[model samples]
Target chain A: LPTAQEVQGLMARYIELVDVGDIEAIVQMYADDATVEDPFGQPPIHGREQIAAFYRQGLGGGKVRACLTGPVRASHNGCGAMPFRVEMVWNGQPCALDVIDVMRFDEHGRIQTKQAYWSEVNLSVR
Target chain B: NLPTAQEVQGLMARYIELVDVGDIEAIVQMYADDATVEDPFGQPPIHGREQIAAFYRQGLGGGKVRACLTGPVRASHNGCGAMPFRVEMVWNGQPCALDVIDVMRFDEHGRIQTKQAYWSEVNLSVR
Candidate 1:
């Protein structure tokens, strides 16, 4: 299992990679059989191939800035949560969303799953 | 055994509601008898129901404390979930809001075994 600091570092790197629109690098951060649930209530997209497709569609459009608004909360059990804001333009309107992502890492320090929490209430026009 | 994802989400929702309403007893009841709580993380956790209740009492002792969930609760495959919420209260004779993400791990009986609140001075806003 990864140490707490390792998990925190990966989380920071995850946001930085997102801000740079590096989809491939982001995909590589996960295990091959990882799952991603971007909005919490939805079913997760599984595996690296599907994960890659998911990111490309979201980050491919343009550069979206992701900023950590709070400290990364790491658990003793190889999981961590982080709060951040994503600023971008949607439907021709500049907007942002407050998101909290929880990630569980495998023994090899690769993310086994990621669950993102956000809702319409978290969305705002800027 | 870990609780199901749905159950975890339910617990997270109920936890926030209990805090908002200042139901300190109900909130404490959600924890295991031997639970540990670290409200701000990074610090030593308070153990057992007695210390936990005292912690909540002091926090909810302030009147008119309101809390709202800022986003959906994120549950992991493990027996834990994280929820972001904003707490409104009076601090230093001024109204302020705090952005906090609480990560809770549940036991087999759906009781919280450990809770870690993620927030710091940076997350506080006076307005």
Candidate 2:
């Protein structure tokens, strides 16, 4: 079982790597064949390469910022989820979104599955 | 008009305060008469205020519960809103942090008509 402290570290590290646009570092946080599903409505993304392509386009420019909305809730079974506010400039238009990432961790403390929950309503032009 | 984000935040804050104070009876006052509760994501829904109250009492006897909102609430003017929060309480005599998300829909009278919570004990253990 992963400690709540470990899960808190995972989320904080994620926000740090994301804000810094360190896609490689971000990629390393997941299990070798992990799955990433943002918003949980689209096709699931598998493996580091596939996941990299999805995030690189968003963070390659280092323009994204994430602010945690609350404390992390982590289960002893290696699952953790936290809500965040994401701010970015997309196509020169400022955008803001509220997102929740529910992550399932592998035994090694890497994310095996990341299920994101949010909706179009969470998006706003800021 | 639907609740504002501040209103929703206040709602959770008050809810937490009641839970912390062990005001189980008072906690039910915030819900509508027929409201339902799903404490964790995969459990059978406990319908109506009576069942909901009973459910709370089941594990609440020896545990102290407290919570905090994770982010500003998102509300639609259509009497709906959602809040993500983390709860800390003594579960089976061990203090644990419980991550939770709640979606609430309100009636015209400002009481929660529907409340759904998503959480799990898969990661919880005695510390």
Candidate 3:
């Protein structure tokens, strides 16, 4: 089981990988059969390989990129289950999305199962 | 006029009422001509009154389901409106509950345009 600080570090690492466009590092965080679901209606990208491919295509295609995550809240479900919510910022726009990322860990304290949910907030630019 | 924010909240209450009592016809009437529903599992969006009616018939039938919606945060801009809520529901014969975060959007005429729901299974047997 990961402590709250360790979970926070993982979330920070996730934001760093996205901001720096480190696809390789991002891929390493996912488990073998990890899944990434964008939202309610979108089809999930299954498996770490496909998820890596997605990041390579999507994040690699974007410019003017700076991602920052903050204001995280975490709780453990007594059975080594940890869930958290964080704010994600891309470019200059901030999305106040509520995310619940559930994680399972191996004996080496590495993540074994990671699943997250995020909602897109519509932003208006002046 | 169709309905205001208060009226929409009232309508939501009525919606739960119809579902709890299995009032199929009343449920059918509550929807707009352009109402739509989309589940969280990437299912195709169910559109129009007929499809919405069928959704309630199949999913909300044959079981006693009760819902309690809380923390309804509502906002409106331009002509669009949304009500994001936290819901607690009891379904079927199980003592377990489901916790949901639902955001319902409405058109200018007060017809529901889109509804997004996110839920997780909960153990409410103790509560």
Candidate 4:
């Protein structure tokens, strides 16, 4: 299991890379067999190929300013969460979304699972 | 062994229910003997049973507090979960809501060992 600081560092680094819309770097942080469930209730995206495509579509449009709204919280085990906001355009209008992402890391320090929590209610016109 | 994802979700749901009803004692009982709580994340954590109880007492004391999960609780492979909820209460004679995410770690016995509340003034909104 990863240490608390390792979990914290990964979470923080993930957010920083997201802010810059570094899709390549972001995809590298995940396991080849990782799964991503953005918004939780949706069907998860599996494997690195699919995960890379997902981020490309989401982050490829333009620069997204993603930043942590609170400190990253790490568990005693290999898991961590962080509350953050993504500033971007939605439906051709500027908007921001408040999100919380919970990640579980694999033995090799790669993210094994990621579940993002957010809804339409968390979106605000900017 | 660590708690399963379902178990972590169940505990998180129970925590929300307890806080919504202002059940301070029962809420404290959900925590381990040497638990720690860090509200708003960056503040100094309140340690142990006595301090944890006092912290909840002041927050859940007597005000008309209501909490509802805004999204499904996200559980980890380990004994932990993250829940997003909206806390409703009166602030300065006006209705207000605060969006919060709490990341909690559970011990083997399913009692919370650590809790970090992820929220700030920016998350608070007057309704």
The per-model lDDT (C-alpha) reads 0.83, 0.71, 0.50, 0.82
| Model 4 lDDT tens row, A7-126 | 878999999998888899999999989999886657899988899999998899866789887666665567777777899997789998777897889889999999886656457798
- lDDT (10s digit) by residue, model 4, range B1-127: 4667678878889999999999999999999999999886667888999999999898879679999887666666567667778899888888998777797889999899999886655457894
lDDT of 2: 0.71
Q: Model 2 residue A32 lDDT?
A: 92
Evaluated against the true structure, the overall lDDT of model 4 is 0.82
**Model 4 interface DockQ:** 0.08
How well is each residue in A83-117 modelled by candidate 3, as lDDT tens digits?
22333455667544333343444444455655443
DockQ of each: 0.15, 0.14, 0.05, 0.08
- Taking chain A by itself, what TM-score does each prediction score? 0.97, 0.93, 0.63, 0.97
- Model 2 chain B is weakest, by summed lDDT over 10 consecutive residues, at B118-127
DockQ of 1: 0.15
Which candidate order results from sorting by lDDT in descending order? 1, 4, 2, 3
Off by over 4 Å in 2: B1-53, B59-82, B86-99, B102-127
What would the per-residue lDDT of candidate 3 be over residues B6-61, giving only the tens digit for each residue?
56555555565666677877876766688777653134678888888888788667
Highest lDDT: give the candidate number.
1
| Clash pairs detected, candidate 1 | none
